[PDB]
Amino acid sequence: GSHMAPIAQAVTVSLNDLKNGTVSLEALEEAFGPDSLGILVVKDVPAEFAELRHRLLSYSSYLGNLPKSELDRLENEKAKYLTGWSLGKEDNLKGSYYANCAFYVDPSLSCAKPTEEFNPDNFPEYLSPNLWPQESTLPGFKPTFEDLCRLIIDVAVLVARACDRFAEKQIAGYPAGYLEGVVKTSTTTKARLLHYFPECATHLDHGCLTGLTSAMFVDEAATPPVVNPSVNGSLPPLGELPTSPDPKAGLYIKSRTGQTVQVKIPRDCIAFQTGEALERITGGKFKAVPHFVRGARAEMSAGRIARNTLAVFTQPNLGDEVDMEQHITFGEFARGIVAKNTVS
Template sequence: MADTSISQAQPVTVSLQDLISGTIPFEKLTEAFGPSSLGIIVVKDLPSDFEHLRAQVLSNSSYLAALSQDELEKLESPQSKYLVGWSCGKETLRSGHFDTLKGSYYVNCAFYQNKELQSAPAHDFPDFPQYTAPNIWPPTEKLPSFRSSVEELCSLIINTAGLVARACDQYALANIDGYQDGYLEHVVKTSLTTKARLLHYFPADSASSETNQETNEDDWCATHVDHGCLTGLTSAMFIDESLHQPSSTDPTTPLPELPTSPDPKAGLYIRSRTGEVFKVNIPKECLAFQTGEALELITRGKFRAVPHFVRGAKTTHGKIARNTLAVFTQPNLNEEVQPGKTFADFAKEVVDRTY
């Protein structure tokens, strides 16, 4: 991608308090999600514990990836098509191309509804282990804070997503014929299928990262759309693992974070609804929410899924890892996203073509 084609986006930003009070003007939501938008909104002024939780959870992504191959294999779930627990090299985002540049840790967020639940109930969908296989957690002696910090941060993100959903419902009710009042907030607050994905983009040496960027603008995560409703995103954490080796650091302590990306071109890119490509920076103290395919179906195209990709960091020194967390809020398996098509039907189509 040529430098002249890179534009820095200024996404719509709202405060958490304005979401709570329900005072976000429709003009803001149109700017965020309307026909010429980027389909993304940033929320600031988050609860006081957010920044610490983000630092610990994203550090845990590096601590996790530093475990031995044998230990990581014990955290895999082939029965769920690797959509629970650890996954690396199982996903195809380009035809015939398996993604080995990042590792993922998938978590079912049914605990948001009931702390005892670790997946959606299997009795109604026995052949859908992607959402009904129980969570796998790393052993506490290896990663003592992993489970508690992930559950706390995911719950905070889902709470915030519910407020964004409430604002979207108000907008949709006024602009979409036949829209079901309160539907999106209902999806977020009652779903047993919300899925979190903790990501670790492995450090690349300078030669391979330069080669990749000469050929692929989306070398770290190919252009795709999410298949849920609203995706909650933290900002990325960049860590120089040559200076701070996760395998020799206390895993209860957040790793030192680079103040900025080592490569200003690295990070999240969105392809707007007018076909332009914009780089999006999420401030460290904020969350972002973007639209997915299920929401596009539900709103009959008024809200559209956001094509996006991640571009890797070109580095001349160090071993730079990138960690982030995405939380995909989505309907329960038996809810319709189109007449005659449940979310289970739709999600199976997506999984079959991707994994």
């Protein structure tokens, strides 16, 4: 279509090269550096990814369609609704399900552990325990969620390792392996499962690396997102439309030309966007790049089309330094602190 935005190709690397340390650092800088789109697509992902993505994005629909009484049990106002379920608006009504990924570090953790300055009362949005649906209500939800997040974070750790290789060659005084260690040991990383119910300005991501699946569009009239009480076993996946109902749906990124470009994530791949904490850790050698996500227009969506998405926001622990020069930690950074121990 002549009215479409320009399509751009995201830099794409193989998981095999991330695993073996052979990934091109020039490709990495083209993906994440000052002239870049701030996004890297990873192909050759583990064999289980496609089915785990299909299942968890289906669970987003199952979860969003539960009776309101069931969803009310998952709301967590003291956590600023950044744990558990919430209804939000953008006229785009959306259900959000948030969980911290401390279980990545230790399967026994329901959340991070507090520190002298970081107690769960002044950082409840990072440190509150997860609020999981009843196992009988959404059978298999929690293990599917954990397994997919673990897969995506495993890959994020390898992307962070490549970032470290770059930073170690390019930045004097850089701590060896810093980003890898930060991502791999973070108990503040947060996953978000979004459900856009059937019926823009840019931002920067805040953390280190946001792992992304391609969105799932589902006709909920054709495959009702209903937990059949007569059917046993983990919930089967729903249908997924082979193509978006609206060609304009997807990720838009402000490019170096001044064009706002559309970027598509292959359904069988994982993408990673840089955030502000990674930009600061690398002294601006890598950049968080402004972007936004567009859904499908209602008038283009035949039937009862829902959109489900997953993002895994890897970010530092609250006490991890993000500005290595001024010694500003991620928790300070997140409270809008921009200077530290400036003399009085």
